Amino acid sequence: GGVMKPHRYRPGTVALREIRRYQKSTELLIRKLPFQRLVREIAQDFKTDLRFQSSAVMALQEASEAYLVALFEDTNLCAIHAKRVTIMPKDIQLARRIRGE
């Protein structure tokens, strides 16, 4: 006599569920303190001993998330044109090349 588990989701089902879940909402997806530390570190290379505004970091985060979302939106079209489901770095590079980056 044992405890039987019902079943396993078919792969991709929960993936699409997450796609809807994160396309419905409007929030910040990136870890804020690590993002802040990263910005400080890369800003140390241009002027020592700087200081930041909270909104000045929030705007950077918004712009970065929008840029990455657009990049992936184009890359997904590239991958589909390649008749693939999985997304590849060659797809990313093609997207940037055609976009002009």
Binding site: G2, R17, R21
Partner: protein, 412 residues
């Protein structure tokens, strides 16, 4: 044959013709439900994208929210805010649209179900309903119930920490059997934010054919069970051959980030569940690893009790080979700091040393147990030393031979 009536009747246990010995159940119930969920913060509503007409039915009329809906494809039923309103067909767990079922006897393996009429694929049959357990109660109630000598265990793991019991209260889905040729299956649908388990068909089942679903194989104690279907390759056994633990059967709790103690306690209890000490060298190795991590007096006492109850000379020898004497020496040295509360642990350690098949005094000298015991309850230690040396004693009351115990039992 089902005949659901509220009056309790004269059928003992088999529930084939009289269903009113136990109680039935509606949508399941909870015990420790708190408001920590994704219910109404981001899954407030997940509305499908449909532009219907809904004014032309029965003539050029397409059924609403068919297999092109965004929610049906992702295994979500719609809410009451659907643009179709009361014409949407996704809400099958709420309108209780079920299939025609009946429970009679088919094989001596047990009771089950057979299809009444024709039933197509991807058709809902029944919802699995029961009582929702929680983290602590499962591993206690299961060992409380294993000693009741029951054949059927109605336990189904919803998540890694949730197990639903369908024993005290159960719907008509509790009789469905196991086979290696499944025609129905189980799906994890999300309704009203809560996860529910349903039963779907896969093929065109003829009228009067079996409707079973495949078990994700699992075993829980030392014994094994076998299936009696034998379609074309049937794996022979419910649960397969491989053994898994109490936690793996239930899904091991998402540990509250307290302490380490709970892992040691859970492994100690899994060792103790057999009740007859250590049975194999893998159990011996697990005990040896646990002892290094055990810090509490109760855990040490439980380990000593398990060693004393281990009758296997091979297991005792393996425990000795795995530095058991040094692990005991660690606790004995810790005992040295003179706090009164350690007398019982001292006595149990002495008893465990007596029970262990120590071959030579050199082994105790190497393990450094001998000086601690010589320093050491004092008469228990003196008896241990007398057993380790030879002859005289702190007189011992010799314990009657097993033969004489049996004879004195039979003479009453």
């Amino acid at each position: 044959d089902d005949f659901r009536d509220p009056q309790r009747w004269k059928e003992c246990a088999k529930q084939g013709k009289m269903p009113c010995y136990f109680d039935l159940i509606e949508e399941n119930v909870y015990l420790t439900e708190r408001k920590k969920n994704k219910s109404h913060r981001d899954i407030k509503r997940m509305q499908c994208e449909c532009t219907p007409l809904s004014k032309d039915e029965r003539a050029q009329g397409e059924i609403a929210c068919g297999e092109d809906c965004l929610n049906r494809l992702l295994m979500i039923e719609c809410s009451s805010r659907c643009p179709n309103g009361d014409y949407c067909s996704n809400r099958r767990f709420q309108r209780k649209q079920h299939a025609d079922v009946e429970v009679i006897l088919t094989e001596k393996k047990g009771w089950g179900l057979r299809a009444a009429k024709d039933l197509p694929s991807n058709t809902f049959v029944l919802e699995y309903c029961g009582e929702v357990l929680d983290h602590k109660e499962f591993k206690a109630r299961v060992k409380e119930y294993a000693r009741n000598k029951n054949i059927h265990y109605y336990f189904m793991a919803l998540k890694n920490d949730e197990i639903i019991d369908a024993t005290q209260k159960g719907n008509c889905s509790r009789f469905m059997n196991h086979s290696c040729e499944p025609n129905c299956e189980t799906q994890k649908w999300t309704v009203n934010g809560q996860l529910r388990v349903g039963f779907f068909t896969t093929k065109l089942v003829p009228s009067g054919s079996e409707l079973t679903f495949d078990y994700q194989f699992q075993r829980y104690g030392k014994e094994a069970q076998k299936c009696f279907c034998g379609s074309a390759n049937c794996r022979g056994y419910l649960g397969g051959e491989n053994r898994v633990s109490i936690r793996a059967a239930g899904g091991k709790m998402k540990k509250e980030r307290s302490r380490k103690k709970d892992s040691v306690d859970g492994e100690l209890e899994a060792l103790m569940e057999n009740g007859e000490g250590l049975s194999d060298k893998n159990q011996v190795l697990s005990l040896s690893r646990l002892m290094v991590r055990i810090e509490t007096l109760e855990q040490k006492l439980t380990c000593l009790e398990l060693i004393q109850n281990t009758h296997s000379q091979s297991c005792l020898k393996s425990f000795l080979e795995r530095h058991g004497l040094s692990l005991l020496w660690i606790w004995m040295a810790e005992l040295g700091d003179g706090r009164e509360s350690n007398q019982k642990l001292q006595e149990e350690i002495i008893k465990t040393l007596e029970h262990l098949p120590i071959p030579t005094k050199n082994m105790l000298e190497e393990s450094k147990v001998l000086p601690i015991i010589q320093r050491w309850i004092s008469d228990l230690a003196t008896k241990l030393l007398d057993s380790w040396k030879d002859l005289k004693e702190v007189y011992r009351i010799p314990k009657k031979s097993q033969t004489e115990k049996e004879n004195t039992t039979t003479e009453r």
